[PDB]
Amino acid sequence: RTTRDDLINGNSASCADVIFIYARGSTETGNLGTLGPSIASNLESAFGKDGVWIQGVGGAYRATGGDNALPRGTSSAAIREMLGLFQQANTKCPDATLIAGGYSQGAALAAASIEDLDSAIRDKIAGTVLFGYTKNLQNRGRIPNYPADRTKVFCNTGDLVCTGSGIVAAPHLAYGPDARGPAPEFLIEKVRAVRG
């Protein structure tokens, strides 16, 4: 299922304990793309269907490859969309622990949104996973204003976007195994570290 809108569709009276907001890569389908569904099913295994809400970033985020060249690695409209989802999560479910992730342009989008987010909401993001992080070199493997211990970057050797280039090479498309194992493992561990 490449489209998940659990947060938007979800009943505030029955909020999940964990809300995962994910941004897909450039040109990917639905609002989850290729890696999101794998992370989602593993999160559901750990917390149960009603325990976690999967929300892809859709709406104004068109994941247009051309936008990788913009100052922040994505458009302003896209950042506004993801910021709005974090804000919707915060108001719709005040007590939920948040977790985030992004692939490619979605990773830049995730870093940009997190950097601009109000500190009170940003503190709620227990962990963030970034695959093929387009701003890896520029940001020194960090998300501005967000702790290193809550960040996990998956950058393959030979994935040029991780070393400052905009070229798409084979290793950029080899994150499947990470999304199936270490990425959700990291997210689960970080959520459990704060929620017990």
Curated annotation (Swiss-Prot):
How is activity tied to temperature here?
A: Optimum temperature is below 30 degrees Celsius. Optimum temperature is 30-40 degrees Celsius.
- pH-activity profile: Optimum pH is 8.
Outline the protein's biotechnological or industrial applications. May have promising applications in chemical and textile industries as it is capable of hydrolyzing a variety of substrates including soluble esters and insoluble triglycerides. Can hydrolyze and thus modulate the surface properties of synthetic fibers such as the plastic poly(ethylene terephthalate) (PET), or the textile fibers polyamide 6,6, polyester and acrylic.
Stored InterPro entries? AB_hydrolase_fold, Cutinase/axe, CUTINASE_1, CUTINASE_2, Cutinase_monf
Q: Which UniProt keywords apply?
A: Disulfide bond, Glycoprotein, Hydrolase, Secreted, Serine esterase, Signal, Virulence
Question: One GO CC annotation, please?
Answer: extracellular region
Q: Which reaction does it catalyse?
A: cutin + H2O = cutin monomers
Query: What does UniProt list under activity regulation?
Result: Inhibited by n-undecyl phosphonate (C11Y4). Inhibited by paraoxon.
Active site location? S104 (nucleophile), D159, H172 (proton donor/acceptor)
Q: Where is this site: Transition state stabilizer?
A: S26, Q105
Family the entry assigns: Belongs to the cutinase family.
Q: What is this protein called?
A: Cutinase 1
Lineage of the species this protein comes from:
Eukaryota, Fungi, Dikarya, Ascomycota, Pezizomycotina
